[PDB]
Write a protein that binds this ligand. Structure first.
Ligand code: CA
Length: 220
């Protein structure tokens, strides 16, 4: 006789108002897992990805991105929740995605997308996003195309080479000059053979890497 919570909004609505790591288990997820719950923006945000200081290596393969990786104890650690957990999370409810972005110049923006859904493994964790809102600009647009997740070892992009092999990261890739929040952690402006930093091109360039990123979700 144990109690399980489907996501962070159920935790917040049940009276837990403190931000931090909690155990949740989406309905069809076979096992519970630790997740960061951000309770500060009206409460009940389940953090699915975080970028903070460049500590974690995001240049991983398919199964690493499938299972999740990174730090799950530190308040400001970096992690990727995991594509299978993303699927189980988003399939149990209709969710809004919020992306909080910050600068190396004390500035912040955000983007919000309705109807955030990640498909199952057989469909390559396809990304579904709805209408855009916010202040960062919509960098996930080029009703959006339905793109599949790609890693260096599993190429599912619309580019001839391997997008994920060049950006050293997994993402829902289309053509590698789009936004990528799992890119290499640089300090603002950066130089390389490709734009493989953490980019939100509507706000900063394709050659300015952001300071912190928080991708979180909450029911609709
Ligand atoms: Ca390809």
């Amino acid at each position: 006789s144990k109690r399980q919570y489907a996501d962070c909004s159920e935790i917040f609505n049940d009276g837990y108002k403190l931000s931090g790591f909690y155990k949740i288990k989406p309905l069809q997820s076979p096992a519970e897992f630790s997740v960061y719950c951000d309770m500060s923006d009206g409460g009940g945000w389940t953090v699915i990805q975080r970028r903070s200081d460049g500590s974690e290596n995001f240049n991983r393969g398919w199964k690493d991105y499938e299972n999740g990786f990174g730090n799950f104890v530190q308040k400001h650690g970096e992690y990727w929740l995991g594509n299978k957990n993303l699927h189980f999370l988003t399939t149990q409810e209709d969710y809004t995605l919020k992306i909080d972005l910050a600068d190396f110049e004390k500035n912040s923006r955000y983007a919000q997308y309705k109807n955030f859904k990640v498909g199952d493994e057989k469909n390559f964790y396809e990304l579904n996003i709805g209408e855009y809102s916010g202040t960062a600009g919509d960098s996930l647009a080029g009703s959006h195309q339905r793109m599949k997740f790609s890693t260096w070892d599993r190429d599912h992009d619309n580019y001839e080479g391997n997008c994920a092999e060049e950006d050293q990261s997994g993402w829902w890739f289309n053509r590698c000059h789009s936004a990528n929040l799992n890119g290499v952690y640089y300090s603002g402006p950066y130089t390389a053979k490709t734009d493989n930093g953490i980019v939100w091109y509507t706000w900063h360039g394709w050659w300015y890497s952001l300071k912190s990123v928080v991708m979180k979700i909450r029911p609709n």
